[PDB]
């Protein structure tokens, strides 16, 4: 885990609250093995709903000087709570196709050289990405670790 959010950060659920006041050592694999007050032993409301942000959760966005997210600029990946760029080398046309379709900009795109300046420096995350034909998102495209 990276974050452990609360107060319905991701939204308010509708089903009956099952567990409450959870303390856990972290060794057991299943959530049910942690100490709990019982089943239905809740005194909260739907405004209080737990949420997490795990390490493997990732997102993609094209940063630009004009706006934080846009349809042009430099694409960035977000791994284990940290941001970073993507290696340019070995980037096929279909690779840019998945990036643009995932962000909802256009069916196809093209690679252009860097702009006049960079807003900030971030450590490069991944390189040598080769998207096949058929995947809709970049997370299903094999690449280097």
């Amino acid at each position: 885990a990276i974050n452990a959010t609360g107060s319905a950060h991701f939204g308010e659920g509708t089903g009956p609250i099952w567990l409450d006041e959870m303390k856990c050592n972290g060794k057991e694999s299943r959530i049910w093995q942690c100490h709990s007050h019982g089943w239905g032993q809740q005194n909260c409301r739907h405004k209080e709903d737990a949420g997490v942000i795990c390490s493997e959760f990732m997102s993609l966005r094209l940063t630009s000087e004009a706006s934080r997210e846009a349809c042009a600029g430099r694409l960035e990946v977000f791994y284990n709570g940290a941001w970073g760029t993507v290696g340019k080398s070995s980037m096929s046309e279909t690779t840019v196709g998945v990036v643009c379709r995932q962000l909802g900009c256009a069916d196809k795109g093209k690679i252009n050289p860097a702009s006049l300046d960079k807003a900030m420096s971030i450590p490069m995350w991944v390189d040598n990405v080769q998207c096949p034909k058929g995947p809709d998102t970049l997370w299903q495209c094999p690449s280097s670790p």
Binding site: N43, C44, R45, K47
Partner: protein, 121 residues
Amino acid sequence: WEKRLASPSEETWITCDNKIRLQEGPTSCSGRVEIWHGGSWGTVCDDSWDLDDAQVVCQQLGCGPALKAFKEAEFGQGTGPIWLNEVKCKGNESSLWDCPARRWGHSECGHKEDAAVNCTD
């Protein structure tokens, strides 16, 4: 009954007890916020309990500026009904009754979320 003018000394001027108080705190100027309405005392929930709201409560009682506004019933579990919710004071209001909130409405907030305010002397 008699109709007769008299000096201001014979005239009555009364001053009821204050509607807003802080209780259970270690000091006099700090504690859980307790308000009086409908003939009984009560608490105020911590939803959107900002430091600006705490400033109004300290000003109403007369204590100093509020350094910190807490939540989740730090000092103790409240006793009585819950009156206000989602109260948003801009800081310029003289009384908590001027600020808009869930005015004497049923509060979805439980009794574990009673607010608390710590002011300085």
